[PDB]
Amino acid sequence: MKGTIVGTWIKTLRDLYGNDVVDESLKSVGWEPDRVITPLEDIDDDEVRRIFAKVSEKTGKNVNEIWREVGRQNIKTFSEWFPSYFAGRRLVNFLMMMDEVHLQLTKMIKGATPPRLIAKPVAKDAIEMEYVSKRKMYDYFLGLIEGSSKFFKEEISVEEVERGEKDGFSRLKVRIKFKNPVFEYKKN
Ligand code: HEM
Numbered sequence: 001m002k003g004t005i006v007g008t009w010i011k012t013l014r015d016l017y018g019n020d021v022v023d024e025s026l027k028s029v030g031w032e033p034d035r036v037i038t039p040l041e042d043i044d045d046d047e048v049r050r051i052f053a054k055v056s057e058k059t060g061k062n063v064n065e066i067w068r069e070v071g072r073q074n075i076k077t078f079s080e081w082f083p084s085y086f087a088g089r090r091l092v093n094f095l096m097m098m099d100e101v102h103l104q105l106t107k108m109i110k111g112a113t114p115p116r117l118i119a120k121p122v123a124k125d126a127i128e129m130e131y132v133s134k135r136k137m138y139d140y141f142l143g144l145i146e147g148s149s150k151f152f153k154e155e156i157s158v159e160e161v162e163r164g165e166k167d168g169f170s171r172l173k174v175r176i177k178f179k180n181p182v183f184e185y186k187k188n
C-alpha cells in the first residue's frame, strides 16, 4: 500500500477508536507507536492487515466493519490532508475522476497495483462504478462512497449489483443513484 494512504489510515483509526487502541496495534507489528509514514515509503499489505486484526481484537468489532467505518471516516481525513482533490467539486465529478487519480498517484511506483475504479453514466441520475483489485477491500470501497456522500452533503442510493472474483481480481460493481439529474445525452 502506498505510504501516504497508510498514514491517513492511522490518523483515521485514532479518530475512530482512540490512541491506546492504535498505539498498541502498531506496537504489535513492531512499529514505533508514533511512526510517521513518509511518501518515500510503501507499506506491506499484510502488515496493514495484522494492524487491522489487532484493532478488531481490541474493539470487539469484526474487521470488515472496521474497514467500512474507516472508509467512511477516511474521506474527512483525505479532505483535510489533500484538500485539492475536493476544492470546488461536486460528488459526481469527484467519483468519476477517482480511477484516474488512483493511476496518477501510483504511476511513480515500480510495479504499482492501484485499485481500478472505472465509473460510467447509465442514466440521467445514476452511474455505475466497478471496483477491481487483487486486494479484496470491498468494505473500505463502500465506506469511502458513503463518506463521499456525507462530505459533499449529496444524498445517494447505492445498489450493489455484483461482487466476486474473476481472473484473480476481486470485483464489486455498484449502481449509484443521485437525487437529481446529473447527466444528459450529448452527440458522441
Ligand atoms: C482524495 C481522495 C483519494 C485519494 C487521494 C486516494 C488515493 C489512494 C491511493 C494512493 C491508494 C493506494 C493504492 C496502492 O498503493 O496501490 C488508495 C487506495 C484505495 N482507494 Fe483511494 N483515494 C481517494 C479516494 C478514494 C475513493 C472515493 C475511493 C472509492 C470510490 C477509493 C478507493 C480506494 C480503495 C478501495 C483502496 C484500497 C486499495 C485496493 O483496494 O486495492 N479511494 N487510494
Ligand SMILES: [Xe]
Pocket: 006, 009, 010, 048, 051
Ligand atoms: Xe494502518
Ligand SMILES: [Xe]
Pocket: 001, 045, 046, 048, 049, 135
Ligand atoms: Xe490492506
